[PDB]
Design a protein around this ligand. Sequence first.
Ligand SMILES: C[S@@H](CCCN)C[C@H]1O[C@@H](n2cnc3c(N)ncnc32)[C@H](O)[C@@H]1O
Ligand SMILES: C[S@@H](CCCN)C[C@H]1O[C@@H](n2cnc3c(N)ncnc32)[C@H](O)[C@@H]1O
Ligand SMILES: CN(C(=O)[C@@H]1COc2ccccc2O1)c1ccccc1
Lengths: 290, 269
Amino acid sequence: ELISGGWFREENDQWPGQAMSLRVEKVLYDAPTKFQHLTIFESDPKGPWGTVMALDGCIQVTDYDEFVYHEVLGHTSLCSHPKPERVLIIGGGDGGVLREVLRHGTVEHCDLVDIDGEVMEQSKQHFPQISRSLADPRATVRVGDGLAFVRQTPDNTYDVVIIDTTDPAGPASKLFGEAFYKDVLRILKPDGICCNQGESIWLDLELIEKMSRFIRETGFASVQYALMHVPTYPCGSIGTLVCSKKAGVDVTKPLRPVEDMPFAKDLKYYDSEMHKASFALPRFARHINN
Amino acid sequence: GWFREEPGQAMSLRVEKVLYDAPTKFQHLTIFESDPKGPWGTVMALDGCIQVTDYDEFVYHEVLGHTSLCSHPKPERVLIIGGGDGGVLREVLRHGTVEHCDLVDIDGEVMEQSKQHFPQISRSLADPRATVRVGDGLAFVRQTPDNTYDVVIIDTTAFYKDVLRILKPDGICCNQGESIWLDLELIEKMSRFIRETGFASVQYALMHVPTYPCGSIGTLVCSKKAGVDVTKPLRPVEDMPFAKDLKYYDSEMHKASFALPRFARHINN
Ligand SMILES: C[S@@H](CCCN)C[C@H]1O[C@@H](n2cnc3c(N)ncnc32)[C@H](O)[C@@H]1O
Ligand SMILES: C[S@@H](CCCN)C[C@H]1O[C@@H](n2cnc3c(N)ncnc32)[C@H](O)[C@@H]1O
Ligand SMILES: CN(C(=O)[C@@H]1COc2ccccc2O1)c1ccccc1
């Protein structure tokens, strides 16, 4: 029930005693969905953010910084794979990661599965620059639970799986869980790479340590956390765990540098120097990566 | 019960107790204990802008103090301009090569309040290798002879020529360098103006600071001497005996910090 000229306020128990607030210039969508609360608004036009999307009260995408996380998830993973022909996105309803994955000419086909069909609908309508990808004939966009999708996928189906979900607290709770990640390992081909929505070193450092140990133990050969700067996420950063099925692979140095591909100059955040830099963690977090 | 920092966006931390809140002769100083259920601890703000929190002050203090000193061949005489809380000084003093550090901050009330409410940061203010002055830094460098300092660190809220002049030929200057998200145009202008004033190289080092607006800040690392590549450590911290006492900075972070997002890379490359 947001109102134009009102303020949107983001607080949350997973981060007690801090809040981020954006003045609302224009409400575009604000309603319960089958699965979560979807809010879209145009932010103050004197500010840089543009249109904002929140899911259950938490900002997911803004026009001004959406390229960071989408470019990092899409390119760090695909530039770590020797020939990524078939790709799966779990979540990713807004289309950002799909847009970056489809930059790559090796990609033959990408499946995307998001549980909330209204997220796709609202992104088509209000984020055309993020959502254009969803209509690509190289994509198959499905509405469905990613958990069920992967359980019903045959062994060895994908080169890369990217898990672009919400918090562990919402409809995305088991996509930080155990039959799920074993399923991801199983549906990956031998040289398979997985990357996930990775949580913050400031708020979630214990979860990150736990996830990384347990991804390795379920049977991934290596797991390395890449940090990135996202100004609208709590505490200004988020990371992704980049995981290799195959042993002997060093994801922290690009296997297929983007500089050699024809779109490198269209990117606004990612390049090979940012890719390598993203695996250097502050000392207090470095034990994640060794 | 919230401290609000502010077009059309705000960032708030909940206040548990107000420790200090007065104008100073120079600026508005607010110090508070934040929500004990969150991590931030005691928080200091100046003119409505968060400057220091217990939880994350190590970042900016380690990056400024060590990025600069690890880029100098032998840093023995160091000047800090601003830095009244003590945190850059604490990092500077870890280095065995440092004979002496002068620190000059315009606001003595900041020093006083830091000794009172941030003792893990301001203990450094009473080190015998340090001299703390209360005074304007512009007037201080104007009155400093040529080739006085190996390193000048500008940790603030005719000058850059004075800085260039008071540095020795191998001198390194670093500053509080602003945000690539909020101030990108100012960073490009400053990086040109510092090169024009005479510094031979300027490179911006980016860092993750949760309590600064949009979660990052940076520092311009400027070398008086031509041909110096500050983006790789000249004297790696891993070879010094305090490397493991640090919570943020190491040689990998040093290198990484000069890798800028494509949209900002024209600052460095
Ligand atoms: C919007 S995207 C996050 C913003 C960065 N692109 C988060 C998506 O994860 C979906 N999500 C959450 N749980 C699931 C499950 N179980 N399966 C698939 N997609 C999911 C959710 O509907 C969002 O669209
Ligand atoms: C708080 S410190 C920055 C916080 C990260 N340690 C910023 C200091 O710079 C001082 N400052 C501001 N202007 C000047 C001048 N002109 N000279 C010296 N010190 C100054 C100001 O009083 C703050 O204490
Ligand atoms: C620590 N901190 C933040 O993370 C701010 C506010 O809380 C947020 C919550 C959700 C997203 C982004 C947020 O940015 C901060 C607090 C006060 C001042 C500056 C920074």
